[PDB]
Amino acid sequence: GKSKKWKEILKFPHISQCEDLRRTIDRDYCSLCDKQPIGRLLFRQFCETRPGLECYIQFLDSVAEYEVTPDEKLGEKGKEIMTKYLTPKSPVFIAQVGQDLVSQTEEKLLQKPCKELFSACAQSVHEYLRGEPFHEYLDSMFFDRFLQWKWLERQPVTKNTFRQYRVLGKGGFGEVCACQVRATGKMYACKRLEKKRIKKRKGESMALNEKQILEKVNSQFVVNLAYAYETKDALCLVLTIMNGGDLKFHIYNMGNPGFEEERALFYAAEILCGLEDLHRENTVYRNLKPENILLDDYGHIRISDLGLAVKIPEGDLIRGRVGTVGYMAPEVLNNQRYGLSPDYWGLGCLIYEMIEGQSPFRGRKEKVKREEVDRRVLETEEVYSHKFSEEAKSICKMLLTKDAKQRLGCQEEGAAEVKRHPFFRNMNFKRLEAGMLDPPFVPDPRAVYCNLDHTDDDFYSKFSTGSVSIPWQNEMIETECFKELNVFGPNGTLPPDLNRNHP
């Protein structure tokens, strides 16, 4: 349901309006052709025109399909690619991957199959595209079209850019509504942080820390920031919408309480990928509890409440003693200097709670005081039941190691060490990260699951940076606004908006 005049809101500017953009955007190949969705599509579209580049795009697509292929169907897919791209007499031949690597790839086909068989060829193809093809695309009309899309991206976001529907939750500094972008009709989750209370509580820095952390990470399994704007009475964070409920509700109201080990495996695998994406930024979450894991319309999960996340400088440690009683790692309860370890402790808490239907250190049917709960966390070894396989027991007690130094995932390897644990032995993380594995529970669509200081002005400005680049471009693509507006001249000619004559 896009606005009636949406083709006028997202109307392309004349290319003459984008010269300031042309000369400031860093001409980085990975950024302009891969990281940014619309740039990636436009570069691929450019390669579609030249006959020599089309084959390389098709090959990369087939390698992307190969890496997520089922294990027992690997050799079948690999040989196909070989007969189509790596054969010298093929109509679609990869010429820049010389024979000195075609032969190596054929040796691996003569041997076992690995999901990274075509990694060498794919990187060689990329090493070729970053050269002449990329610099030709920079002087092509498709990069001028990309500049037009960036011009729209940088436009100012106001309250009139969205329309709010209903209030879906309350919090500490404000509330959470459900807004929609009028021009594209995409739903979001508005997070109103009301100004008066931020300045009274002197928690300005925390709002910027959460906003910056949210706009940085671009994970499939953490709520993403799409817009950060300001109104006459609040600061708004437009985040991913999650209508599927929260994991606490499904553990206790929908559960046994608890899930089957396989169901918990799926949710744990997605939470681990979320924590991994966060730790790629040396950002620790510290707020892992079942109610913070939200489900979407499809059944997948994301980590939601980033109000307690902070970015650890590389090589640094921090102090805190923050979180929720029962989900605080011993190093946090002791108020020590820690790194990312609280999140792996939380992952242990989550896996245990999903399988067993209660926290590892307090019973569902137990009336205990915070003092005793903490004492158990610091001194008591959790017990396990027949609901846990041996692998499930293993990963849980390894993640629940009191000594953050010996805790799983807290080595130089990081989340890698966790993905390798035998508890995920039957989990294909490549397919999971690609959204290829079916979630174990799909929420029903219709379901309902539940002043003049001027220093404030400077704070206003650094917060409200506007639309976030990758989420914005993805929004454009999903709502099909890109497919509709991204039209050129008939038969490869220039459209009027891209011709510097007759502006």
Sort 406 into a burial class: Cβ within 10 Å, 0-12 / 13-18 / 19+: exposed
Contact 378, 333 (CB under 8 A): yes
**Nearer residue to ligand A1AQ9 within complex by CB, 191 or 286:** 191
Q: How far is CA 4 from CA 12, 94, 181, 423, 485, in A?
A: 17, 46, 13, 52, 15
Residue recorded with tokens 């190093």:
331
Q: How far is CA 115 from CA 32, 71, 87, 118, 224, in A?
A: 27, 8, 20, 8, 29
Q: In angstroms, give the least distance from the CB of 447 to ligand A1AQ9.
A: 7
- If you compute the radius of gyration of the chain from its CA atoms, what whole number of angstroms results? 25
Task: Say how far apart CA 360 and CA 376 lie, in whole Å.
Answer: 9
**Nearer residue to ligand A1AQ9 within complex by CB, 1 or 363:** 1
Token pair in block for residue 226: 């799409």
Q: In angstroms, give the least distance from the CB of 449 to ligand A1AQ9.
A: 4
Contact 305, 292 (CB under 8 A): yes
**Nearer residue to ligand A1AQ9 within complex by CB, 308 or 328:** 308
Contact 203, 305 (CB under 8 A): no
Task: Tell me the Ramachandran region of residue 326: left when phi exceeds 0, alpha when psi lies from -120 to 50, beta otherwise.
Answer: left
Task: Say how far apart CA 118 and CA 111 lie, in whole Å.
Answer: 14
**Nearer residue to ligand A1AQ9 within complex by CB, 56 or 472:** 472
**Nearer residue to ligand A1AQ9 within complex by CB, 133 or 174:** 174
**Nearer residue to ligand A1AQ9 within complex by CB, 39 or 244:** 244
Q: In angstroms, give the least distance from the CB of 167 to ligand A1AQ9.
A: 8
Q: Which residue is nearest to ligand A1AQ9 (CB)?
A: 171
Q: What DSSP state is assigned to residue 222?
A: B
**Nearer residue to ligand A1AQ9 within complex by CB, 169 or 503:** 169
Q: In angstroms, give the least distance from the CB of 222 to ligand A1AQ9.
A: 9
To the nearest 5 percent, what fractions of the chain are helix, strand and coil? 50, 10, 40
Using CB under 6 A as the criterion, which residues of the chain lie in contact with ligand A1AQ9 when the complex forms?
A: 168-169, 171-176, 178, 189, 191, 193, 223, 239-243, 245, 294, 304-305, 307, 448-450
Q: In angstroms, give the least distance from the CB of 465 to ligand A1AQ9.
A: 18
Q: In angstroms, give the least distance from the CB of 467 to ligand A1AQ9.
A: 17
Token pair in block for residue 427: 């989990």
Contact 29, 134 (CB under 8 A): yes
Q: In angstroms, give the least distance from the CB of 291 to ligand A1AQ9.
A: 8
**Nearer residue to ligand A1AQ9 within complex by CB, 3 or 243:** 243
Contact 264, 354 (CB under 8 A): yes
Q: In angstroms, give the least distance from the CB of 303 to ligand A1AQ9.
A: 9
Q: In angstroms, give the least distance from the CB of 175 to ligand A1AQ9.
A: 5
**Nearer residue to ligand A1AQ9 within complex by CB, 281 or 291:** 291
Task: Say how far apart CA 193 and CA 239 lie, in whole Å.
Answer: 13
**Nearer residue to ligand A1AQ9 within complex by CB, 96 or 243:** 243
**Nearer residue to ligand A1AQ9 within complex by CB, 36 or 240:** 240
Q: In angstroms, give the least distance from the CB of 28 to ligand A1AQ9.
A: 30
Contact 317, 304 (CB under 8 A): no
3-state secondary structure 34-69: HHCHHHHHHHHHHHHHCHHHHHHHHHHHHHHHHHCC
Q: In angstroms, give the least distance from the CB of 264 to ligand A1AQ9.
A: 21
**Nearer residue to ligand A1AQ9 within complex by CB, 144 or 210:** 210
Task: Say how far apart CA 156 and CA 294 lie, in whole Å.
Answer: 30
Report H helices in 280-340: 330-333
Q: Strands across the sheet with 245-246, in order?
A: 245-246, 293-295, 301-303
**What is the three-class DSSP state of 187?**
strand
Q: In angstroms, give the least distance from the CB of 223 to ligand A1AQ9.
A: 4
